Short mmCIF file of C-alpha atoms in Angstrom, two decimals:
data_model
loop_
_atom_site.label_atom_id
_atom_site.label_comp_id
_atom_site.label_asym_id
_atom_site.label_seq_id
_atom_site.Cartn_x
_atom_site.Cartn_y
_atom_site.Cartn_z
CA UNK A 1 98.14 164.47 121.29
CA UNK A 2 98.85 166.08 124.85
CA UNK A 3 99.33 163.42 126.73
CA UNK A 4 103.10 163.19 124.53
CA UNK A 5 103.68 166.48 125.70
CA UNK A 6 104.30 165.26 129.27
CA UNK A 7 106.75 162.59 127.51
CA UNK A 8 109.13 164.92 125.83
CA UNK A 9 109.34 166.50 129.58
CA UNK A 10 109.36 163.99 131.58
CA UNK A 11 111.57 161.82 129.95
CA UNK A 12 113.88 164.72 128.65
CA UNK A 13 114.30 166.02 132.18
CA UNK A 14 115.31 162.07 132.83
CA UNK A 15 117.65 162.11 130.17
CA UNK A 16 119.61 164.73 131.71
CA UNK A 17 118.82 163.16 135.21
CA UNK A 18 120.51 159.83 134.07
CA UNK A 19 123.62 161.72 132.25
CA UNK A 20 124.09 162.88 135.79
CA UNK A 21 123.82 159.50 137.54
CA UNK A 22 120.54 160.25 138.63
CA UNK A 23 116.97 158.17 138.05
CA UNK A 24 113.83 159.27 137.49
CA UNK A 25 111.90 156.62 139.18
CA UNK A 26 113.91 157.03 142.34
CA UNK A 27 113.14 160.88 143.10
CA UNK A 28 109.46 160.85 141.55
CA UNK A 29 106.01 158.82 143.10
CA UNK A 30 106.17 155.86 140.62
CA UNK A 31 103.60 153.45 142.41
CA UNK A 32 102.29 156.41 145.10
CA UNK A 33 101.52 158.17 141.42
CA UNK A 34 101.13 156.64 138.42
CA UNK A 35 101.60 159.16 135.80
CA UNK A 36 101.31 156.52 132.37
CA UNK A 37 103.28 157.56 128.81
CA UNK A 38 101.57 156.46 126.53
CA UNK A 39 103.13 154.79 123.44
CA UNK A 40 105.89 157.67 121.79
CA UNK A 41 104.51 158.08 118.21
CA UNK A 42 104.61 162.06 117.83
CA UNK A 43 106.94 161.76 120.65
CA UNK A 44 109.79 159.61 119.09
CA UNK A 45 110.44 162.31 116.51
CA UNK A 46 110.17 165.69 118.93
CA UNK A 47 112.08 164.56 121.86
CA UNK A 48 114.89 163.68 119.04
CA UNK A 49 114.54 166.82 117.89
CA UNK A 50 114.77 168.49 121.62
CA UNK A 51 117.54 165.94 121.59
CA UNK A 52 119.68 167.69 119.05
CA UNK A 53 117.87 171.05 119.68
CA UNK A 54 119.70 170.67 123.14
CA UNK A 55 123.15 170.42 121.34
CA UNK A 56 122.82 173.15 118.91
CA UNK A 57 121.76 175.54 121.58
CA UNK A 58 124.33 174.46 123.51
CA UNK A 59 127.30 174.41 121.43
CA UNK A 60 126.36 177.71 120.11
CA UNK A 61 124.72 179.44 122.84
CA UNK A 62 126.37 177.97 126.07
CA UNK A 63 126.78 181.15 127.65
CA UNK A 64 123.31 182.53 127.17
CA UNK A 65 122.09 179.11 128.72
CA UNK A 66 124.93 179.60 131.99
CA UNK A 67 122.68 183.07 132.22
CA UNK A 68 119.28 181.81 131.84
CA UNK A 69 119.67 178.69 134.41
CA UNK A 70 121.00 181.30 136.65
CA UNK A 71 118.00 183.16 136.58
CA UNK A 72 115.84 180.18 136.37
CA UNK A 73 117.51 179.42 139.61
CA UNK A 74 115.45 176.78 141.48
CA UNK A 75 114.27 177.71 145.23
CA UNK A 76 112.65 175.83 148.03
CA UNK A 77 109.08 175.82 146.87
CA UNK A 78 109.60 177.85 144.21
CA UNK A 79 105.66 179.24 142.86
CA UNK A 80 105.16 177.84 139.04
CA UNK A 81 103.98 182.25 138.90
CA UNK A 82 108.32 182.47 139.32
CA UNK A 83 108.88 180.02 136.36
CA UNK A 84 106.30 181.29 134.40
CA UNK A 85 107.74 185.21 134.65
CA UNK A 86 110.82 183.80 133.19
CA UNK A 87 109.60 181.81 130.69
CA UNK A 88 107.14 184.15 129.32
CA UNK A 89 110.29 185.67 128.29
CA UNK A 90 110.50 183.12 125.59
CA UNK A 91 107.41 183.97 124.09
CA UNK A 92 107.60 187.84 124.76
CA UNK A 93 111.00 187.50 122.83
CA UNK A 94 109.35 186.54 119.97
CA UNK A 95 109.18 183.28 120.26
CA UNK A 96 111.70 181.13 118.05
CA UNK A 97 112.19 177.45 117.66
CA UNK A 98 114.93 177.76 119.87
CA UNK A 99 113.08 179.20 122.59
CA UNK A 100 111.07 176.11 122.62
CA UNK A 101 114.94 174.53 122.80
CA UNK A 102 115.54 176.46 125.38
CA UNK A 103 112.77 176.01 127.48
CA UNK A 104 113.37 172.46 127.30
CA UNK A 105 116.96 172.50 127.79
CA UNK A 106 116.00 174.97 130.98
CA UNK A 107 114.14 171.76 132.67
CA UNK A 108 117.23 169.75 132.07
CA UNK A 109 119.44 171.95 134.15
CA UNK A 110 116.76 172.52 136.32
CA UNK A 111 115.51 168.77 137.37
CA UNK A 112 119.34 168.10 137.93
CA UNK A 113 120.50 170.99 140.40
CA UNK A 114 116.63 170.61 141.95
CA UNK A 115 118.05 167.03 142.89
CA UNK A 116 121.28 168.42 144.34
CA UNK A 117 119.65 170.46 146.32
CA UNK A 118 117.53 168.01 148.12
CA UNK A 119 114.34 168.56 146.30
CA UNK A 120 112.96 165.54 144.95
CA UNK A 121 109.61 166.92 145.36
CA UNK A 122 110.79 170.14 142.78
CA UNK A 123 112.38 168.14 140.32
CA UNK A 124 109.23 165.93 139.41
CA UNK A 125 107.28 169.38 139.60
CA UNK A 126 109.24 170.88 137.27
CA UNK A 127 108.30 168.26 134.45
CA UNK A 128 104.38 169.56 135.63
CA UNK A 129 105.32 173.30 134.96
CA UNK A 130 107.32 172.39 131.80
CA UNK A 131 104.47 170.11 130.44
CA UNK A 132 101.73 173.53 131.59
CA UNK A 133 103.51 175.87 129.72
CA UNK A 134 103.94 173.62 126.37
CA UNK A 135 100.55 172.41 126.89
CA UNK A 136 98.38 175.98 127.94
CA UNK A 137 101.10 178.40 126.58
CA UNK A 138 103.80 176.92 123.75
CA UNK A 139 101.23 174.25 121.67
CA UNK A 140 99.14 177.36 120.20
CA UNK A 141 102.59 178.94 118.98
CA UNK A 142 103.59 175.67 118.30
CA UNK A 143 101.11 174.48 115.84
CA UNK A 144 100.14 177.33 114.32
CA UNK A 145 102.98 177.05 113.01
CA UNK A 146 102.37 173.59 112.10
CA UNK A 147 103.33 171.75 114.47
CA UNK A 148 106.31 169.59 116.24
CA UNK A 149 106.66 167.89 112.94
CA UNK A 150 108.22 171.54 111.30
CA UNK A 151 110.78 171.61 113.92
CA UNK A 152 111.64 167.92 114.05
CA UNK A 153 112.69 168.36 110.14
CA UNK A 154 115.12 171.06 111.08
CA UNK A 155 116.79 168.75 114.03
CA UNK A 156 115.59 165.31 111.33
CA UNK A 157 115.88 163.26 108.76
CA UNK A 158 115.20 165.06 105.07
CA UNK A 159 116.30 168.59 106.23
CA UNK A 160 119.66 167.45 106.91
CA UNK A 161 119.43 164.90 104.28
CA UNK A 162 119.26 167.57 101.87
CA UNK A 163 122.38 169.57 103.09
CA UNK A 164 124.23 166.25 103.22
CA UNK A 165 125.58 166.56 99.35
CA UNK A 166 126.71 170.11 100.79
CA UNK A 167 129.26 167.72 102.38
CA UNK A 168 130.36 166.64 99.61
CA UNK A 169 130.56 170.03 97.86
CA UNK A 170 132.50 171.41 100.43
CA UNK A 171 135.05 169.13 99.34
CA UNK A 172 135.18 170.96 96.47
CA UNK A 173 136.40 168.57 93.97
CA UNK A 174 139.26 170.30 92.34
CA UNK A 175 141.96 167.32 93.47
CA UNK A 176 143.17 165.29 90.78
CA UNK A 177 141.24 161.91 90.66
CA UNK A 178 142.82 159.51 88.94
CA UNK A 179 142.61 156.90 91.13
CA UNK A 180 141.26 155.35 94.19
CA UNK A 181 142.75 157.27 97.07
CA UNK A 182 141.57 154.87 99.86
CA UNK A 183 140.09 156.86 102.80
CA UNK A 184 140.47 161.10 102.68
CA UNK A 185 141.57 161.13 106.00
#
């Protein structure tokens, strides 16, 4: 419900963390604050399709994301009124799927160098200002227009599933098949 929303933060942010060699549970209050996931229902399809959200907008927009950390630029006790006057520039862009892509791929970058920079404190934080804006500012967008589960199926299962025999006509089957040609490449 909203609760998830903290998940596909928190444990995103940890996902780049631990691609980094760093752990969650080391820089965050586990037992000084218990902040409890509950079990990832919604969540096991969304952060997947953060997941390969990440790599599309990354692959494809790699510079634009060198140019947004930059400016996202984490600060000793950097305000959440800072974060929030960049990422309202997300939603004042017109808010795509892949600003909600962004903005998650943003707290990835951000968790890491917020680490690096001694500020253990900032990179737990950030999962708070992350989960805030999808919570107060990204859900409305989000499910009026329906919901995580429309932009799971463009990162999922049947949307891809469906351009999958594109595959297979991209071969273009105009070579001679008389046989069984064991492997194609």
């Amino acid at each position: 419900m909203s609760q998830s929303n903290r998940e596909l933060v928190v444990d995103f942010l940890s996902y780049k963390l631990s691609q980094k060699g760093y752990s969650w549970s080391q820089f965050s209050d586990v037992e000084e604050n218990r902040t409890e996931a509950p079990e990832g229902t919604e969540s096991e399809a969304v952060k997947q399709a953060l997941r390969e959200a990440g790599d599309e907008f990354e692959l494809r927009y790699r510079r634009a994301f060198s140019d947004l950390t930059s400016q996202l630029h984490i600060t000793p006790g950097t305000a959440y009124q800072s974060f929030e006057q960049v990422v309202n520039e997300l939603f004042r862009d017109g808010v795509n799927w892949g600003r909600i892509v962004a903005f998650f791929s943003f707290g990835g970058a951000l968790c890491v160098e917020s680490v690096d920079k001694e500020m253990q404190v900032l990179v737990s934080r950030i999962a708070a200002w992350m989960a805030t804006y999808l919570n107060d500012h990204l859900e409305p967008w989000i499910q009026e227009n329906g919901g995580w589960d429309t932009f799971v199926e463009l990162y999922g299962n049947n949307a891809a599933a469906e351009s999958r025999k594109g595959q297979e006509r991209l071969e273009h089957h105009h070579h001679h098949h008389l046989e069984h040609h064991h492997h194609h490449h």
